[PDB]
Amino acid sequence: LGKFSQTCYNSAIQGSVLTSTCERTNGGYNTSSIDLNSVIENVDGSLKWQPSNFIETCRNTQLAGSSELAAECKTRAQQFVSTKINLDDHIANIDGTLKYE
């Protein structure tokens, strides 16, 4: 499931939009963008795979490592702490286009 990093490169993240170049099934490269906001939520300090507009309570979203997304999110105590989530869990590349599964 996911692992789009196996056939995509030059991946970049801006705000909540994931943008990357992925290989097409019949050869060639395709470039597309998708909003991770509809699938990531903040649970008492940690980002989880569930919709809730996490960026509304999180800031400084950036690309960490090859497939890890690191950001800072508010805990129930109103303090920003370090949080991370594995994009490889559900973000996959289908025919050169990114699609959550």
UniProtKB/Swiss-Prot annotation:
Record SMART domains: CVNH
Effect of substituting residue 51 to G: Protein is mostly monomeric and has wild-type anti-HIV activity
Superkingdom as given in the UniProt entry: Bacteria
Statement on biotechnological application from the UniProt entry: Overexpression of this protein to provide quantities adequate for medical use as a topical microbiocide has been attempted in a number of systems including E.coli, Lactobacillus jensenii, the yeast Pichia pastoris and Nicotiana tabacum; see PubMed:20162270 for a review.
Post-translational modification: Cleavage, or reduction and alkylation of the disulfide bonds results in the loss of anti-HIV activity.
Result of changing residue 30 to A/Q/V: Prevents N-glycosylation upon overexpression in yeast without changing anti-HIV activity
Cysteines paired by S-S bonds: 8-22, 58-73
GO MF annotation: an example: carbohydrate binding
InterPro entries: Cyanovirin-N, Cyanovirin-N_sf
Disulfide bond among keywords: yes
Pfam families tied to this protein: CVNH
SUPFAM superfamilies: Cyanovirin-N
GO BP terms: regulation of defense response to virus
Keywords, in A-Z order: Antiviral protein, Disulfide bond, Lectin
Free-text function comment from the UniProt entry: Mannose-binding lectin.
UniProt similarity note: Belongs to the cyanovirin-N family.
Extra remark: Its activity in situ is unknown, however it acts as a viral entry inhibitor, inhibiting HIV-1, HIV-2 and simian immunodeficiency virus (and some other viruses such as feline immunodeficiency virus, measles virus and human herpesvirus) infection and replication. It prevents essential interactions between the envelope glycoprotein and target cell receptors by binding to carbohydrates on viral protein gp120 and possibly by other mechanisms as well. Addition to cells must occur before or shortly after virus addition.
Self-association state and partner proteins as the record states: In solution exists as a metastable domain-swapped homodimer which very slowly converts into a more stable monomeric form at room temperature. Under physiological conditions it is unlikely that the dimeric species exists and indeed the monomer is more active against HIV. Interacts with HIV-1 gp120.
Protein name: Cyanovirin-N
Lineage of origin: Bacteria, Bacillati, Cyanobacteriota, Cyanophyceae, Nostocales
